[PDB]
């Protein structure tokens, strides 16, 4: 991986450059504008409906880092139902439309 000697990022300075949408292949893509302490492991987590304890974010980009000239694109596969994809304090209401 890249970014194992870094830290988890800020919770605040993530803003949506890009709207989380479905890929047409049951994954959710996005892009953040992190203008803070770079680079760092993005706190990507996505809970489900029925249990807000457990993170169920089956990631496709592992270990996302916002580099000094790079980083942003995150893709994840999710189980069906209501899903709150957190990127720090910034979150996103999502329903996985597949069964």
């Amino acid at each position, epitope marked *: 991986m890249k970014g194992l*000697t*870094y*830290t*988890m*990022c*800020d*919770k*605040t*300075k993530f803003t949506w450059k890009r709207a989380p949408t479905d890929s047409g292949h049951d994954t959710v893509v996005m892009e953040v504008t992190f*203008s*803070g*302490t*770079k*680079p*760092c*492991r993005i*706190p990507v987590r996505a809970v489900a409906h029925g249990s807000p304890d457990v993170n169920v974010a089956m990631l496709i980009t592992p270990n996302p880092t916002i580099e*000094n000239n790079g980083g942003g694109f995150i893709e994840m596969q999710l189980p069906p139902g209501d899903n709150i994809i957190y990127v720090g304090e910034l979150s996103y209401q999502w329903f996985q439309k597949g069964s």
Partner: antibody
Framework: EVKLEESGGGLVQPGGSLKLSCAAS????????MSWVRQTPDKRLELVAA????????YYPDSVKGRFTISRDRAKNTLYLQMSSLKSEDTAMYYC?????????????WGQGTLVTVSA | DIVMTQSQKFMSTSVGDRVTVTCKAS??????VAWYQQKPGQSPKGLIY???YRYSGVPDRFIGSGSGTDFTLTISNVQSGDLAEYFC?????????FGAGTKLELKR
């Protein structure tokens, strides 16, 4: 009145160990983050351990990477720094910090600061 | 690491004058701007972040600018409580490196 009372200022030989604390007041804990910043006696500042809210993870520069242990407590209002294997150039004014709601890298309010002289 | 070199090491000013402090950067860091104000024995003050914002407790005497490599901390109405040490800082890179310190002085 936001207060950051530093403590744990002693006189330990190099290759030793300290444990700093910081009595915090005037702000809720987990909505913000806490960190340590040192100042050398010849007026050259240096980061010790910057870290985010909620005690997620710990950063260290390569000068002190893998030796110290920064930890925290929410309700008790205490920022810890479990140090070990003291370098002789660790004689510096250790400052308890207070980052903003936005975690801006910089620190809005501060403390009076102590001196941990690492002398041979 | 990204160095933050202050051009103003030991500068002086009067009471009523408006002066400013600049600070270098090894590369384009943009709006990762941070300054301070510490007196000897007392605490620093995280006045301006991102070159245009303030915290509650900072007056209109402290403005700022500079997005890129060179920053700008313009201070109008230099009081007796501005006799202090002004630090520079980038919070782009890890580690968030610092300026050595601009000792603002009184003209005599």
């Amino acid at each position: 009145e936001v207060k950051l009372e530093e403590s744990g200022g002693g006189l330990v030989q190099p290759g030793g160990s300290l444990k700093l604390s910081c009595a915090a007041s005037g702000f809720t804990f987990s909505s913000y983050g806490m960190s340590w910043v040192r100042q050398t006696p010849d007026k050259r500042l240096e980061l010790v351990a910057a870290t985010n809210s909620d005690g997620d993870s710990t950063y260290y520069p390569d000068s002190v990477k893998g030796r110290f242990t920064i930890s925290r407590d929410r309700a008790k209002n205490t920022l810890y720094l479990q140090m070990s294997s003291l370098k002789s150039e660790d004689t510096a004014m250790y400052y308890c910090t207070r980052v903003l709601y936005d975690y801006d890298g910089e620190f809005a309010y501060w403390g009076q600061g102590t001196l941990v002289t690492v002398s041979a | 690491d990204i160095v933050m070199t202050q051009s103003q090491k030991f500068m002086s000013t009067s009471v009523g004058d408006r002066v400013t402090v600049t600070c270098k950067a090894s590369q384009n860091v943009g709006t990762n701007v941070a300054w301070y104000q510490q007196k000897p024995g007392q605490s620093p003050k995280g006045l301006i972040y991102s070159a245009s914002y303030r915290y509650s407790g900072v007056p209109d005497r402290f403005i700022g600018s500079g997005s890129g490599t060179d920053f700008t901390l313009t201070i109008s109405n230099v009081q007796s409580g501005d006799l202090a040490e002004y630090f520079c800082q980038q919070y782009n890179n890890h580690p968030l490196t610092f300026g050595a310190g601009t000792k603002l002085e009184l003209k005599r």
